[PDB]
């Protein structure tokens, strides 16, 4: 239990029904607080958004998209993957939300980068790229070791142990050279009888190094990205529908756009518009989870230094586009089940689905790009985004990328109402971040931007839990 | 797709209802053949065997085990994981057998090895072991590069490109040293506000190198092992129950122990015992999928050189033991969801389940060992196997490994009736004996994973079946 039971009658108004707001309300309700959540959208979850057939969104350019994905097919437009250490998994257990493996590493997906080599724009499987990179890296270090270059820092026994590892790790020949490997895979698959298959032949060391084909390998080691990774069965938003049901829709107002938030003698008063009608609520405390760049637009009585601090959390660009195909060509032709291809192209990566394996259709995330490479899609119409996504994807996965397309749906977070950002990038543990951890009398800020896991649900959930703890301690005093 | 409709009446008898025999029967039927499968066990799938509540097995030592796993809980005693290139996945599609990801790599599982270092017998997470190993490896290669040791094989531009890669790959400091990394993980998890968490500190370079904590990293790169890997929901045996259902139980005799296989004028006659009674069946062709070391025990009229060739496929030892725990401590305490811990101990590895994530109970594969390290379990009683498994596992995962144990079940393939081997190793390893056994012996064809280039994979058995069925069809077509 996060906190004990509160004594007496105490109320909180929560602004925003994304992860931070819903977690706050859930934990406060458990402890016996009166809670009301005000959410501007007509769905729970905020930047956790899962697109399915029937999903409709009008972006800030006024373009309306209507998703027509087949029944049971979806993709996560925002949050999609969860590492094992995140409290998000603890909440899935608490809420009864089934999880499954998320394919965050795949030997059979492709890398494709421009370079001043003949590999420029050429797709290479991760296993082939890794075998060559680690093969030559191991050969080079073994050579330097054998040459005596490391004799001042490695003993004879150290050298022997290192050499043994390098021969194994690089699949080196008996004489210490990288000559290729079954780890690269096969042009023709080994089968029965005399069908030995045909190993894919290695690139040259100069090709490997000068192509930068290993530039994405360290992604596999990210603390928040290393396998095993997880995701809820049927979409990430299921966590937030589960929170909603535990909180009770009687305690959440959807379609409630907050327009004012003020400390008053009675507590905190929040004005909002819902169903075109003007409403007001007063509670003893407020938890404001509205993205920080949007808070200043509210009528408010926050001190100037707080308003300035909020402006330091700079918006960031990110977006995705999903294409439903009526043939799972990635599985049938490329032998790709989940995972992502990686590229320097604007699309940045192509992410293959982790569900409906071996079915008749599926949604591919044709891009998930951020920063400069999302700016390249943000101002395009959806039709233009799709055309660009298909063109770039076909340069990686071939002409099959252009065929069997049923429908598509995109989001760009900076252009999305009530988000206008994928996640915060603080100017310069900064003074402004630290300032915003303090209450403004009875108003508390919470959200992933006020954590050390920005752009992770874990950040939002831990922020919520800290703020709830602070309110509870204050009430106790 | 494999073959397109045979003309007239043609029959095949298939000896063995494991993957090769069932695949053979399935494809022959699709092409219009009369087929009968003779299987000694009461279940389809052979070395694909899934232990669940109600499974009873009497091994060749006379010990009977009765599995009492909770409903829905199981483990694969034989085949358990499938890489993306294997035709096994295409059969799952054809048969409507749902698959899920198999966790074959996990940053949070442990390595634990003996060495002449302070890491001897100490559990280290894969991510910490990898960060330290690749950190110091990268530091050392960058040092050698900067020193000029590779100036004869790398240009100035190559050196700069390599240096850039190594700094990133090893998470090196700006001046080229490995000083630790968030990649190692945290003793306290980063949270909100000023709760930054605390990174796990690195081991020293010599300790890391001499500990051999990286000795299993290359497993991640195995062609048949690299992620992404898959497995059927509810057990690998679902593939073979699906084959059984498509073939029809009317075309499969279970509890049929073949005792004789002979070429005869009209084809092949196979004698077998079923329901205590001596039976005989004759068909135009036979496909024999009985493991090769067991074929010589049959009455037969195979030529001497064929009998000799069969003996070159040497049997091997492998086994597993599963423990149902009433608390998923690996998830709740160690933040391990699937994957395997790896060790030099006899248990060899501890494999955590890939289903029922976040639930109240689960089966852990407390060992999966082969060769010498399975010989250490083969002659032990199940109770002794369990005691050894728990002792060794507790040395890796702590006292929690000994708690909340509900039940257990083990198999050792050399001691298992109708298998007596996990898989074949051909003496001299194609070897001449392997090549010889690809040829028909008049109307008898051999098939199985041992007659493939994917021995110990269902893919090997399935491609063998397909090749043999194709040969029979081409011959029938003339
Ligand atoms: C592209 C992308 C990729 C991501 N990848 C991952 C991932 O793989 N794994 C992971 O764990 N997380 C991921 N995330 C991060 C995750 O989505 C966030 O950490 C989480 O949603 C933050 O929760 P929050 O409550 O702080 O903010 P939000 O989710 O932004 O919620 C704020 C809420 O406030 C509401 N609101 C705004 N204005 C008003 C108003 N005027 N009145 C009332 N309500 C208002 C919004 O509608 C919204 O529901 C990703 C997010 C994005 C966008
Ligand atoms: C420990 C272990 C781990 C494995 N790991 C993997 C893995 O992860 N992935 C994977 O794809 N594969 C794996 N396999 C390999 C897979 O199980 C085999 O490739 C496959 O079962 C071989 O099929 P088969 O038909 O050639 O032989 P078998 O499966 O051995 O079938 C032979 C059949 O013959 C029957 N038989 C024997 N004698 C008689 C008789 N006298 N009369 C009638 N019938 C008889 C047997 O009962 C059996 O059903 C593993 C196997 C083991 C044992």
UniProtKB/Swiss-Prot annotation, chain A:
Predicted to be exported by the Tat system. One of its GO terms (cellular component) is cytoplasm. FAD binds at residues 19-20, 39-41, 47, 78-81, 258, 448, 455-457. InterPro entries: Amino_oxidase, FAD/NAD-bd_sf, Flavin_monoamine_oxidase, TAT_signal. It comes from the Bacteria. It is an enzyme of class 1 (oxidoreductase). Can be used for the preparation of D-amino acids by resolving racemic amino acid mixtures and for the production of alpha-keto acids. One of its GO terms (biological process) is amino acid catabolic process. It catalyses: an L-alpha-amino acid + O2 + H2O = a 2-oxocarboxylate + H2O2 + NH4(+); L-asparagine + O2 + H2O = 2-oxosuccinamate + H2O2 + NH4(+); L-methionine + O2 + H2O = 4-methylsulfanyl-2-oxobutanoate + H2O2 + NH4(+); L-phenylalanine + O2 + H2O = 3-phenylpyruvate + H2O2 + NH4(+). One of its GO terms (molecular function) is L-phenylalaine oxidase activity. Its EC number is 1.4.3.2. Optimum pH is 8-9. Keywords: Cytoplasm, FAD, Flavoprotein, Glycoprotein, Nucleotide-binding, Oxidoreductase, Signal. Its main location: cytoplasm. Substrate binds at residues 81, 225, 368, 455. Homodimer; non-covalently linked. Belongs to the flavin monoamine oxidase family. FIG1 subfamily. Catalyzes an oxidative deamination of basic, hydrophobic and aromatic L-amino acids, thus producing hydrogen peroxide that may contribute to the diverse toxic effects of this enzyme. Is active on most L-amino acid (39 on 43 tested) with the exception of L-Thr, L-Pro, and L-Gly. PANTHER family: AMINE OXIDASE, FLAVIN MONOAMINE OXIDASE. This is L-amino acid oxidase.
